[PDB]
Amino acid sequence: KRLKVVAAFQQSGNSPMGMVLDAVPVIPPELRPMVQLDGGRFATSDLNDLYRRVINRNNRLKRLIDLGAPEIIVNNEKRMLQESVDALFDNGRRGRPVTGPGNRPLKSLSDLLKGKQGRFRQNLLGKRVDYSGRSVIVVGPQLKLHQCGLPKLMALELFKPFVMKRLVDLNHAQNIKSAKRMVERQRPQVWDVLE
Amino acid sequence: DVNFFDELRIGLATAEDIRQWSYGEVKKPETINYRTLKPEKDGLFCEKIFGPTRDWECYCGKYKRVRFKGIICERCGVEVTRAKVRRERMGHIELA
Amino acid sequence: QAITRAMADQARTIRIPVHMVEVINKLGRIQRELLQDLGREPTPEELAKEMDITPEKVLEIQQYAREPISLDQTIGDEGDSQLGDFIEDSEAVVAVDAVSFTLLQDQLQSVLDTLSEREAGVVRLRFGLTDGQPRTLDEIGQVYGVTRERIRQIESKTMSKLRHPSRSQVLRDYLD
Amino acid sequence: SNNSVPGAPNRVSFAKLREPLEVPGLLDVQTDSFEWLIGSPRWRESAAERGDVNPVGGLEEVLYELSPIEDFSGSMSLSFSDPRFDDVKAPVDECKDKDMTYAAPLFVTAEFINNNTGEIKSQTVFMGDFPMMTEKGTFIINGTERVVVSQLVRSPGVYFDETIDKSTDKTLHSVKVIPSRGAWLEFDVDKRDTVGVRIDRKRRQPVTVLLKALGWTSEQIVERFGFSEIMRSTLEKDNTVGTDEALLDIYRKLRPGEPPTKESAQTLLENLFFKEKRYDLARVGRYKVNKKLGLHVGEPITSSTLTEEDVVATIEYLVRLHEGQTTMTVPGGVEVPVETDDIDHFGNRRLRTVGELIQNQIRVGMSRMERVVRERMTTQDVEAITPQTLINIRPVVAAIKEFFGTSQLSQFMDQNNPLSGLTHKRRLSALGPGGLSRERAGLEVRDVHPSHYGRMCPIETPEGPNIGLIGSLSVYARVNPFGFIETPYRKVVDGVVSDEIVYLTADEEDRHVVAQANSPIDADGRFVEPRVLVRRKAGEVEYVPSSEVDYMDVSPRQMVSVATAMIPFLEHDDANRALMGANMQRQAVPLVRSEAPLVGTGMELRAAIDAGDVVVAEESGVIEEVSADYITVMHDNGTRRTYRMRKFARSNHGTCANQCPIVDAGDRVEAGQVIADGPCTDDGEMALGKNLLVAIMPWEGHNYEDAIILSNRLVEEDVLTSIHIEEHEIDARDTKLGAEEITRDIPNISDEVLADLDERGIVRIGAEVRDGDILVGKVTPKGETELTPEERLLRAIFGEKAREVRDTSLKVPHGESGKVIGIRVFSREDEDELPAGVNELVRVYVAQKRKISDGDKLAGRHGNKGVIGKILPVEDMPFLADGTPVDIILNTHGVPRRMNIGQILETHLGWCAHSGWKVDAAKGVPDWAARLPDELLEAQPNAIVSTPVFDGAQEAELQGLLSCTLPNRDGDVLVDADGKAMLFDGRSGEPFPYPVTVGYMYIMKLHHLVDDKIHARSTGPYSMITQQPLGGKAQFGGQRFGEMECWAMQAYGAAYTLQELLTIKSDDTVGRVKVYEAIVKGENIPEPGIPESFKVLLKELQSLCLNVEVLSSDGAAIELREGEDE
Amino acid sequence: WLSAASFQETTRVLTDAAINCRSDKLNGLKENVIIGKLIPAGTGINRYR
DNA sequence: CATCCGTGAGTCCAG
DNA sequence: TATAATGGGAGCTGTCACGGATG
Ligand SMILES: CO[C@H]1/C=C/O[C@@]2(C)Oc3c(C)c(O)c4c(O)c(c(/C=N/N5CCN(C)CC5)c(O)c4c3C2=O)NC(=O)/C(C)=C\C=C\[C@H](C)[C@H](O)[C@@H](C)[C@@H](O)[C@@H](C)[C@H](OC(C)=O)[C@@H]1C
Ligand SMILES: [Zn+2]
């Protein structure tokens, strides 16, 4: 078992030193977004309070070392810094999770990947799509096997840029901007266009 | 931006790799200002580090036009490109 | 002293200066003083007069005191519905509106043609099509090889020539 | 008649005479509890009549547990008493309107006692505004009506379990002591015949170790537990001896890392299990342990804590039950049955109502301010201390605010129909804080327990993943002051049924023997047969002589809930379809006007009244004046009360609550009578649907697979038509570029679009609106950014200067439409109190008069759901002889599979009720109609009847009633004794070859209408992070093409279709824009690019110190629309 | 390691893959769907493509 | 062959 | 920012079936 680890660092010039970090990468802001809602209140990602947690303790370490504090106080901060960077990479892994308001555990970096709601199985193996819809189904004995009854209102929104095309074709609309306004207002023409 | 690339390799990141990625070290815990509602400097949203909030709009406002492209304003050191960059530009924190 | 100072400075996810914290704490203090005095939570108009005598600011203060909420937080009934999944990316570009802009370019390309080379010259000069900047007119006539500011003379020789594609209403549609 | 009590229309009942007791106040589950919390006058009297010695209110209790608050010195002492409310700050109707919380301010008397100075300062403190409950058993939090659901939890106490060993195959006995709040304690028995104990899930140790730690001698261990060999084997294998050595041993295993003093191990063993601070069995926690051990059984409840006597008596209970003993007397205690306990028994399974849930959250808020109190005492000086300075109520107001705002038990009130709300108030949930998770729930928790009889319904429960975890409370059940569920039983002295009734808890019933309700009884009260049907402990049934009958059930319909009892011929439908049928009545929608069903069960009266969505008279009198607006009643004493009608109000679920006056002017009305009724109510009765002319046959495939076929009469006569109101909102805030202003002046809009507005900018009352139109014209100042150099040019030509105001108007959402039936404007200018930053706030209420259409979901009471397949012209309808077209054509195929032939029996009884009948009295009263009550031997056309569940009509009588059916107006009978009738195909003209089952059936219009369910989207809004489309019809989102949905694509081998959906259709930032262009330009679809969501991943791996590089075929790391730099 | 990570035990997969420096040849169904490439099956194979 | 910690435990919808 | 003050506080309760490290 031990060889399976050690031989892996041997082969590829992949140093084992990497398991110890001197600098932690900060994920782009738009991926940890801070948003103002219509209620005036702000909504921010959890990562922002974990990053904030590290830098607050990391800088406090800088002040403590510089002041020449006793090892008892300096070592404490280091332990705190350790748990801080830990709870950033994987929360709940070691010890109790970091709670925010409501005793709610904060999402960590690795929590963005794990399981169902994770970036893999929720956003990559399955995505949401444009040009699509949903409705109640009803038996249609009148239809042939290769047919289906697609609601008039549904089709107009599915084929919306397809219809705008033929509206400016047959001169019902002068441009593409007006053609949109004819489909939105549901003028009687478009039903002839859509068919 | 061709689609066809052959291999996707993963490795154990060096501490030096971390610094090669980052466009600057976050030194403040501060996110934004409480009045201006703008990304405070050397913070988690600092525009010197991650990029402009609005397209081709420099932080201090000395440059507010599409005419300046890739220009690093001297009063706040903000490159002028799309805010599209704030989804791709990295940062880092130097642990003591 | 160190705690309360470091408390006011760090606790806020969005940083407020020390005096601003001194205010809100005074506000919560005068509130709890007027609380037991009126058997009811006091009106903004009432709170204001006692401490700062200004009503507009007290409203503003009470929004500063408001603590933000987390995007990653969810709704209680089901553990799949997170808040950020409802935040519409206001930034993202509308397909039709950007395409309609592109069709506006094809109409101004049918304007650079009917206009002369002198006429389609000052057009892209002070408006800044290829430039991206609007150069001052006293610099435009001197940067261009025709003098006696005849380039401002050609300007009026175009303003009415632009009325014809305007009378064709092919530019009239794209303004509404 | 069935319920001849209030003044209700006559609904004749097939029955055995039910005179035990009327349906109790259905809302008393909510009412009685809140009255205990506040300690209302009506409660203290209710405590008196129940004979409750020294009653303590919900608020009174918290104060006494708290009082007094002293510091470590004992110098200071704060204590509370006498809680009292003022008048409510604002009426209910005003709270719904102004979005404020219906509450009454709470006061208390607090005094600061000081032992040193000997002085006492006493004054009244404000505690905040206290959420009061309506008369309808609801709360109103911020203008939305809410409901507090009762939680089913595991009762505190000591439980014994019998687990079987896998290896040794011997019986191992385990015990577990459960506190209301505190540390854990479980004694278990090994296969090694050595007793062990796990404290708060720490490692196992010999139990004698604990006895020598308590102080008990090693000789007393031999005396008390010597009668077993498993305890002698335990004290023998005992590692160490000595009172000091045991405490040290326990300490060393409990809290490693801390210096063990002889004085520090003695202390925590006292604190972890014997102090009120860290450990606490509730009143139930004490009472339940005591019953199980039988000590201090008579003595009143004073101990809130565990004792040493409890510990020893527990271990004694463990050992005896291990070696086969069946009974045991604890020294100093009465005899107690010894066995293993079923955790799911309703004697051990507890129900905490509204009062306790609020009380608990109150207790939380009090212990918080107590922390601040004990801090504010050591700070300030003794002389200047008043309670006003010590007390911070801010945590209290925040603990009660949060609960109603956040908790999983403060729910949006199910307001589809009056029944929907009624069932919401009587729900029993296991989910929620202090309870269990949905994943944590196994299969035993969910299935039907024997003790559920008469307390909780076994039919009413959700179909989904929540099944078994949520239930309805039974009809006749109520909640006792200890949080358990009682149920009424008739008392039988010696074979003689008495009208004396006693409520029994679950385990109390287990020690007795009960007779089924339908067992034949003498006119005096004696049983008919010696051996009768008898219910016994562990759900076991056997015949037992009448000498042994203790009690008998009140009613046949005792086991069911309120919604369940409204399903005619329930005993004919399998539990599965019967289940849905109960979950679906809640889903019905109020129709323009409502008819009471032709067939009922008698539960339709009391349900509507108790719902509180009808208007009931308080005092008897005469209608002095009636309007559509309000009814004025003149009382006998001379005083006048006036009831204001709710007219066209929007419910929580957008259905239309509309009350109309029943009584005409000058009518003499008695108290408690229905003077005006609301939605889904006809003359004071639950009217969830309409009576429809059914026809059981396959018809041209349009009804295939549970689809439904309708007559156009139902659309031309608004029979299945409903009103739906929406509420649209918008406000004007202060921005950084100025302030949003509501105006009629909107940039680049014709006067044709603005035509339906007023001078303000608001739409005008009575105007009609379509989707996309303007409701409230609001403009906002836009950021002064350099406008387009291509639009600068476009503004010089036409010479039109740009405005700095962008359109931010409130337009009508897609799919919505109707008439504007009222505007509600709030202005900061007109002193209307708004939130900080808002100026003008507008609400527009649009009503839609929706007719029924294809896709709308119709359902009967028997779990027979189905959507509308086709609405034929009225003439196409298979009609009877006299030319009457049927209403609804149900498919035959979907009946005998679902085992719900109750829908059939209702149809048979449905025709009988419509046509009327008359039994043949010549040559006597026929032998089939011999059990038939006299009132039903003759029936009028359009007569209403009752078929109480587990009673009512029998198949014999029903067959007979089909024969008696009166002829139509043309003097011709229409159906036969088979219940069928000949039909003519409205299309071909030829009559159908075989007789078709025809009659009337009660159909409900559920709230699953296509108008709400239909949705589609081309392009729209996109996610902020993943850049994928947003989700939901409300957000104009797209559909999800999930992991499962991709497998189908791959299996097909449709690679390009699959790729397109996951690329240019989804999160290809540049791709989707260019696909739009290529479509409107009639060009070819471009080749997809890199998914922006994949790009997100690599940044998420990178941020985790994972050097991820994309390599080309050569071996060089390439760029992903980005670059690296230090 | 991409197919594996999108399966189960995502944290366990990545720690190992990072250490072993495991290079991924994007030649599989699971692997390709994630990156948006045409799946190496059906109409996606070069024989037909 | 039996314990202790970590990792699994259907989908779409609305909300 | 000079009276003296010196070691925390809520735990969380009803899974289930399995592999790998330890016995
Ligand atoms: C705050 O409470 C929330 C849950 C907390 O969490 C959590 C764990 O504790 C819960 C408790 C204590 C419940 O008693 C409950 C419940 O009784 C119920 C559903 C059913 N959940 N489904 C819903 C979505 N669906 C497609 C899948 C499953 C629930 O989930 C819960 C529920 C939970 O989920 N229903 C039923 O029993 C019956 C059969 C029908 C439902 C009637 C209507 C429809 C609802 O009552 C409406 C009027 C709202 O009131 C609720 C929606 C609440 O929403 C709000 C904000 O008010 C919600 C209960
Ligand atoms: Zn600048």
Short mmCIF file of N, CA and C in Angstrom, two decimals, chain A residues 39-138:
data_model
loop_
_atom_site.label_atom_id
_atom_site.label_comp_id
_atom_site.label_asym_id
_atom_site.label_seq_id
_atom_site.Cartn_x
_atom_site.Cartn_y
_atom_site.Cartn_z
N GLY A 39 -35.08 43.89 -3.08
CA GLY A 39 -35.43 44.26 -1.73
C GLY A 39 -34.39 45.14 -1.05
N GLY A 40 -33.35 45.50 -1.80
CA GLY A 40 -32.30 46.35 -1.28
C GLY A 40 -31.20 45.57 -0.59
N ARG A 41 -31.56 44.44 0.01
CA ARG A 41 -30.59 43.58 0.66
C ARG A 41 -29.66 42.95 -0.36
N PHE A 42 -28.46 42.59 0.10
CA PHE A 42 -27.46 41.97 -0.76
C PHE A 42 -27.43 40.46 -0.55
N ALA A 43 -27.09 39.74 -1.62
CA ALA A 43 -26.91 38.30 -1.56
C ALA A 43 -25.50 37.95 -2.02
N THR A 44 -24.76 37.21 -1.21
CA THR A 44 -23.39 36.87 -1.56
C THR A 44 -23.15 35.37 -1.45
N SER A 45 -22.11 34.88 -2.12
CA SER A 45 -21.76 33.47 -2.02
C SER A 45 -21.17 33.17 -0.65
N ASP A 46 -21.10 31.89 -0.30
CA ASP A 46 -20.55 31.50 0.98
C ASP A 46 -19.04 31.63 0.96
N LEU A 47 -18.45 31.46 -0.22
CA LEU A 47 -17.00 31.48 -0.36
C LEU A 47 -16.41 32.80 0.13
N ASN A 48 -17.17 33.88 -0.06
CA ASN A 48 -16.72 35.22 0.31
C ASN A 48 -16.50 35.39 1.80
N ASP A 49 -17.19 34.59 2.61
CA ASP A 49 -17.02 34.68 4.05
C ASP A 49 -15.97 33.70 4.54
N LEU A 50 -15.62 32.74 3.68
CA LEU A 50 -14.57 31.80 3.99
C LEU A 50 -13.22 32.39 3.59
N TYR A 51 -13.19 33.04 2.44
CA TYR A 51 -12.03 33.81 2.02
C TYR A 51 -11.77 34.94 2.98
N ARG A 52 -12.84 35.59 3.41
CA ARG A 52 -12.73 36.68 4.37
C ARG A 52 -12.16 36.14 5.69
N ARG A 53 -12.56 34.92 6.03
CA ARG A 53 -12.14 34.29 7.29
C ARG A 53 -10.64 34.01 7.30
N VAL A 54 -10.12 33.54 6.18
CA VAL A 54 -8.70 33.24 6.04
C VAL A 54 -7.86 34.51 6.17
N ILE A 55 -8.20 35.53 5.39
CA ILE A 55 -7.39 36.75 5.29
C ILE A 55 -7.39 37.52 6.60
N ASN A 56 -8.51 37.46 7.32
CA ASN A 56 -8.60 38.09 8.63
C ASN A 56 -7.68 37.44 9.65
N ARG A 57 -7.58 36.11 9.60
CA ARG A 57 -6.73 35.37 10.53
C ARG A 57 -5.29 35.34 10.05
N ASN A 58 -5.10 35.30 8.74
CA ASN A 58 -3.76 35.31 8.15
C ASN A 58 -3.03 36.62 8.42
N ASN A 59 -3.78 37.72 8.35
CA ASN A 59 -3.20 39.02 8.61
C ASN A 59 -3.01 39.24 10.11
N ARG A 60 -3.81 38.55 10.91
CA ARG A 60 -3.67 38.67 12.36
C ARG A 60 -2.43 37.91 12.80
N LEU A 61 -2.11 36.86 12.05
CA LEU A 61 -0.87 36.12 12.26
C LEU A 61 0.33 37.03 11.99
N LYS A 62 0.23 37.84 10.93
CA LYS A 62 1.30 38.77 10.57
C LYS A 62 1.56 39.79 11.68
N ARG A 63 0.49 40.30 12.29
CA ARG A 63 0.62 41.28 13.36
C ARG A 63 1.20 40.64 14.61
N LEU A 64 0.76 39.42 14.90
CA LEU A 64 1.21 38.72 16.10
C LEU A 64 2.69 38.36 16.03
N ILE A 65 3.13 37.87 14.87
CA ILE A 65 4.54 37.55 14.68
C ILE A 65 5.39 38.81 14.81
N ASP A 66 4.97 39.87 14.13
CA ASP A 66 5.69 41.14 14.11
C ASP A 66 5.82 41.76 15.50
N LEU A 67 4.80 41.58 16.34
CA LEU A 67 4.80 42.10 17.71
C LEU A 67 5.67 41.25 18.63
N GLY A 68 6.02 40.05 18.16
CA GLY A 68 6.85 39.15 18.94
C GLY A 68 6.10 38.53 20.10
N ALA A 69 4.85 38.17 19.86
CA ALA A 69 4.00 37.57 20.89
C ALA A 69 4.55 36.21 21.32
N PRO A 70 4.19 35.76 22.53
CA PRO A 70 4.56 34.43 23.00
C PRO A 70 4.06 33.32 22.08
N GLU A 71 4.73 32.18 22.09
CA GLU A 71 4.39 31.09 21.19
C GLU A 71 2.98 30.57 21.42
N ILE A 72 2.48 30.71 22.65
CA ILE A 72 1.16 30.19 22.99
C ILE A 72 0.07 30.89 22.18
N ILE A 73 0.24 32.19 21.98
CA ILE A 73 -0.73 33.00 21.24
C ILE A 73 -0.53 32.87 19.73
N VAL A 74 0.73 32.85 19.31
CA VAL A 74 1.08 32.72 17.89
C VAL A 74 0.68 31.35 17.35
N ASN A 75 0.96 30.29 18.11
CA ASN A 75 0.59 28.94 17.69
C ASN A 75 -0.92 28.79 17.56
N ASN A 76 -1.65 29.45 18.45
CA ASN A 76 -3.11 29.38 18.40
C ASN A 76 -3.61 29.86 17.04
N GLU A 77 -3.14 31.04 16.64
CA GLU A 77 -3.50 31.64 15.36
C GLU A 77 -3.20 30.71 14.19
N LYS A 78 -2.03 30.07 14.22
CA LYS A 78 -1.62 29.11 13.18
C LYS A 78 -2.61 27.97 13.07
N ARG A 79 -3.02 27.43 14.21
CA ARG A 79 -4.05 26.40 14.26
C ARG A 79 -5.33 26.94 13.66
N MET A 80 -5.69 28.16 14.04
CA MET A 80 -6.89 28.79 13.51
C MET A 80 -6.77 28.96 12.00
N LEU A 81 -5.59 29.39 11.54
CA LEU A 81 -5.37 29.59 10.12
C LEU A 81 -5.51 28.26 9.39
N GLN A 82 -4.97 27.21 9.98
CA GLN A 82 -5.07 25.87 9.40
C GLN A 82 -6.52 25.47 9.19
N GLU A 83 -7.33 25.56 10.25
CA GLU A 83 -8.74 25.19 10.18
C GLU A 83 -9.51 26.08 9.23
N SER A 84 -9.00 27.30 9.04
CA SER A 84 -9.62 28.29 8.17
C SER A 84 -9.46 27.91 6.71
N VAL A 85 -8.23 27.55 6.34
CA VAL A 85 -7.93 27.12 4.99
C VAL A 85 -8.56 25.75 4.73
N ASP A 86 -8.64 24.93 5.77
CA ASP A 86 -9.29 23.63 5.67
C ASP A 86 -10.77 23.79 5.36
N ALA A 87 -11.44 24.58 6.18
CA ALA A 87 -12.88 24.78 6.06
C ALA A 87 -13.23 25.50 4.77
N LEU A 88 -12.21 26.04 4.11
CA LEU A 88 -12.38 26.68 2.82
C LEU A 88 -12.34 25.64 1.70
N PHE A 89 -11.44 24.68 1.82
CA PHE A 89 -11.28 23.64 0.81
C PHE A 89 -12.31 22.53 0.95
N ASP A 90 -12.68 22.22 2.18
CA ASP A 90 -13.64 21.14 2.44
C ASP A 90 -14.21 21.27 3.84
N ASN A 91 -15.43 21.80 3.92
CA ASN A 91 -16.06 22.08 5.20
C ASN A 91 -16.73 20.84 5.79
N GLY A 92 -16.52 20.61 7.09
CA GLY A 92 -17.10 19.47 7.77
C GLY A 92 -16.22 18.23 7.75
N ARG A 93 -15.23 18.24 6.86
CA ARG A 93 -14.27 17.14 6.73
C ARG A 93 -13.64 16.79 8.08
N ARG A 94 -13.00 17.77 8.70
CA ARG A 94 -12.41 17.59 10.02
C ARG A 94 -13.10 18.50 11.02
N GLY A 95 -13.77 17.90 12.00
CA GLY A 95 -14.47 18.67 13.01
C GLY A 95 -15.82 19.18 12.53
N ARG A 96 -16.48 19.96 13.37
CA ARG A 96 -17.81 20.48 13.05
C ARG A 96 -17.73 21.59 12.00
N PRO A 97 -18.75 21.67 11.13
CA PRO A 97 -18.75 22.63 10.03
C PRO A 97 -18.79 24.08 10.50
N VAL A 98 -18.35 25.00 9.65
CA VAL A 98 -18.50 26.42 9.92
C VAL A 98 -19.94 26.84 9.65
N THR A 99 -20.62 27.31 10.69
CA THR A 99 -22.00 27.73 10.56
C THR A 99 -22.08 29.22 10.26
N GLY A 100 -23.03 29.58 9.41
CA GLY A 100 -23.37 30.97 9.20
C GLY A 100 -24.61 31.28 10.02
N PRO A 101 -25.45 32.21 9.54
CA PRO A 101 -26.71 32.48 10.23
C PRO A 101 -27.69 31.31 10.10
N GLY A 102 -28.27 30.90 11.22
CA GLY A 102 -29.26 29.84 11.24
C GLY A 102 -28.65 28.48 11.49
N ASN A 103 -27.42 28.49 12.02
CA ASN A 103 -26.62 27.28 12.23
C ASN A 103 -26.47 26.47 10.95
N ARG A 104 -26.54 27.18 9.83
CA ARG A 104 -26.44 26.56 8.52
C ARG A 104 -24.98 26.39 8.16
N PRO A 105 -24.61 25.19 7.71
CA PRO A 105 -23.23 24.95 7.26
C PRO A 105 -22.95 25.63 5.91
N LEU A 106 -21.84 26.37 5.82
CA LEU A 106 -21.49 27.06 4.58
C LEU A 106 -21.02 26.10 3.51
N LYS A 107 -21.35 26.38 2.25
CA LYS A 107 -20.81 25.61 1.14
C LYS A 107 -19.33 25.91 0.98
N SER A 108 -18.51 24.86 0.93
CA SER A 108 -17.08 25.01 0.71
C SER A 108 -16.74 24.85 -0.77
N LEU A 109 -15.46 24.91 -1.10
CA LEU A 109 -15.03 24.82 -2.49
C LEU A 109 -15.35 23.45 -3.08
N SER A 110 -14.96 22.39 -2.38
CA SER A 110 -15.21 21.02 -2.81
C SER A 110 -16.69 20.67 -2.76
N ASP A 111 -17.46 21.42 -1.99
CA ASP A 111 -18.90 21.21 -1.91
C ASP A 111 -19.59 21.62 -3.20
N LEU A 112 -18.85 22.30 -4.07
CA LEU A 112 -19.37 22.73 -5.37
C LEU A 112 -19.32 21.59 -6.39
N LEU A 113 -18.68 20.48 -6.01
CA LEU A 113 -18.45 19.38 -6.94
C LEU A 113 -19.16 18.09 -6.52
N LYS A 114 -19.28 17.86 -5.21
CA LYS A 114 -19.82 16.62 -4.65
C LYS A 114 -21.27 16.31 -5.02
N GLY A 115 -21.55 15.02 -5.22
CA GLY A 115 -22.90 14.51 -5.32
C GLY A 115 -23.83 15.09 -6.37
N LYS A 116 -25.14 14.97 -6.12
CA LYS A 116 -26.17 15.36 -7.07
C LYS A 116 -26.13 16.84 -7.46
N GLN A 117 -26.27 17.71 -6.46
CA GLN A 117 -26.28 19.15 -6.70
C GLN A 117 -24.92 19.71 -7.11
N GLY A 118 -23.90 18.85 -7.14
CA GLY A 118 -22.55 19.26 -7.48
C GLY A 118 -22.36 19.62 -8.94
N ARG A 119 -21.27 20.34 -9.22
CA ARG A 119 -21.00 20.86 -10.56
C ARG A 119 -20.95 19.77 -11.64
N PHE A 120 -20.67 18.54 -11.25
CA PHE A 120 -20.58 17.46 -12.22
C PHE A 120 -21.95 16.93 -12.65
N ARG A 121 -22.70 16.36 -11.70
CA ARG A 121 -23.92 15.64 -12.03
C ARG A 121 -25.12 16.57 -12.25
N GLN A 122 -24.99 17.83 -11.85
CA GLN A 122 -26.11 18.76 -11.93
C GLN A 122 -25.96 19.75 -13.07
N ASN A 123 -24.73 20.11 -13.41
CA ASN A 123 -24.52 21.17 -14.39
C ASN A 123 -23.82 20.72 -15.67
N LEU A 124 -23.17 19.56 -15.65
CA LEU A 124 -22.43 19.07 -16.82
C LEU A 124 -23.03 17.83 -17.47
N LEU A 125 -23.45 16.88 -16.64
CA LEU A 125 -24.08 15.68 -17.16
C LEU A 125 -25.54 15.92 -17.55
N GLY A 126 -26.07 17.07 -17.12
CA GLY A 126 -27.42 17.48 -17.46
C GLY A 126 -27.57 18.99 -17.39
N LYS A 127 -28.12 19.59 -18.44
CA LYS A 127 -28.23 21.05 -18.52
C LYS A 127 -29.65 21.48 -18.85
N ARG A 128 -29.96 22.76 -18.63
CA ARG A 128 -31.22 23.34 -19.09
C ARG A 128 -31.05 23.87 -20.51
N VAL A 129 -32.13 23.83 -21.28
CA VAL A 129 -32.03 24.14 -22.70
C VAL A 129 -32.99 25.24 -23.14
N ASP A 130 -32.56 26.01 -24.13
CA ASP A 130 -33.43 26.96 -24.80
C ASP A 130 -34.34 26.20 -25.76
N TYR A 131 -35.23 26.92 -26.43
CA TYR A 131 -36.12 26.35 -27.44
C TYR A 131 -36.78 25.08 -26.93
N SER A 132 -37.49 25.20 -25.82
CA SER A 132 -38.13 24.05 -25.21
C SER A 132 -39.25 24.48 -24.27
N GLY A 133 -40.17 23.56 -24.03
CA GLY A 133 -41.34 23.86 -23.22
C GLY A 133 -41.97 22.64 -22.58
N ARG A 134 -43.16 22.83 -22.02
CA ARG A 134 -43.82 21.79 -21.24
C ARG A 134 -45.30 22.11 -21.10
N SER A 135 -46.12 21.07 -21.11
CA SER A 135 -47.56 21.23 -20.95
C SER A 135 -48.21 19.91 -20.58
N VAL A 136 -49.51 19.97 -20.31
CA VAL A 136 -50.30 18.79 -20.04
C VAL A 136 -50.50 18.01 -21.33
N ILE A 137 -50.51 16.68 -21.25
CA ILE A 137 -50.79 15.85 -22.42
C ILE A 137 -52.21 15.30 -22.40
N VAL A 138 -52.73 15.02 -23.60
CA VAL A 138 -54.10 14.57 -23.80
C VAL A 138 -54.13 13.60 -24.97
#
